[PDB]
Amino acid sequence: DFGDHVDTSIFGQILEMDEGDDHDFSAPLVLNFFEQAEETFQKMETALNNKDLPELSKLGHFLKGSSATLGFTKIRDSCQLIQQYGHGLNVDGSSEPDEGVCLKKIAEALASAAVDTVALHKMMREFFE
Amino acid sequence: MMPDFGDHVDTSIFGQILEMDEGDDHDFSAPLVLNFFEQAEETFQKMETALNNKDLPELSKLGHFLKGSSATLGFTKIRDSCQLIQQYGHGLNVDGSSEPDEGVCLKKIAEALASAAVDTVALHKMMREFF
């Protein structure tokens, strides 16, 4: 019971596809997702010290897609914000004129994304082994 | 008997941690290090929560803590991110300059935290590859 961190329905089907206790299809898939997500952060980091919103918006759109594939709705929702805010848009729905407010909320959301990553990285280690 | 952790680890510090073992067991270090990422992973989950509630003191304490624990291993890249957490968890700039603004601190904390959260993962791998 990953609980909060993994859409119970989505991942089931990723594990169903396996044949046997090899963990033959799912473990390739999630291995790469973590290696992939770790780079998308190094970038998001560089881009926040860049103080982009465009670049950040885009990184956030992406890792939403790739994470929504595995039902990692924790990391998804964070990236959802990275996109929203990166696109100068607030949580209530109003536009966010202030560039700083975005960068702050982004950094805040990126950190909180980078966390559940390390959290799920452990949860997945314990699960697969 | 030679890892090029490079930026991630203080060779000096980790040297003495690995000297305090007995052979291929890594009997002292591998346990202590193994727990670190158990501890670090916990610390972060709190930091996030704390940060989500705009609690500059608690963040500060968390940093102060994890700094020491990390500092002891020679995990410089992760130590220094914490140094910025705790120091800003006071309202203090990188230099020592005053930082009156909360939103300014929170951002640089999240920035630094995020960056800790990465090297953790990065090193976690590097270590597994070492062990």
Author numbering:
A (entry chain B): 45 to 173
B (entry chain A): 42 to 172
Quote what the paper states about this structure.
If the HK incorporates a REC domain (REC-1) is denoted as hybrid histidine kinase (hHK), and the first His-Asp phosphotransfer event occurs in the same polypeptide chain. In fungi, the HPt accepts the phosphoryl group from REC-1 domains of various hHKs upstream of the signaling pathway and forwards it downstream to REC-2 domains present in at least two conserved RRs, Ssk1 and Skn7. Also, we have obtained the crystal structures of Ct_HPt alone and in complex with REChHK6 bound to the phosphomimetic BeF3−, as well as the crystal structures of REChHK3 and RECCa_Sln1.
However, to assess the impact on protein stability of the residues involved in salt bridge formation, we produced single mutants E82A, E89A, R158A, R169A, and a double mutant R158A/E82A. A thermal shift assay revealed changes in the thermal denaturation temperature (Tm) only for R158A and R158A/E82A which dropped to 54 °C in comparison with the Tm of 61.5 °C for the WT. However, SEC-MALS analysis with mutant R158A identified a single monomeric species in solution with a MW of 19.9 kDa similar to WT. Thus, the salt bridges involving R158 seemed to play a relevant role in the stability of the helix bundle. We determined the structure of the mutant R158A, albeit at a low resolution of 3.4 Å, observing two molecules in the AU with no differences in the helix bundle with respect to the WT (rmsd ~0.6 Å for 128 residues) but in the crystal packing. The absence of R158 changed the electrostatic nature of the interface and allowed the approach of αE in both molecules to a distance of ~4 Å between Cα of A155–A155.
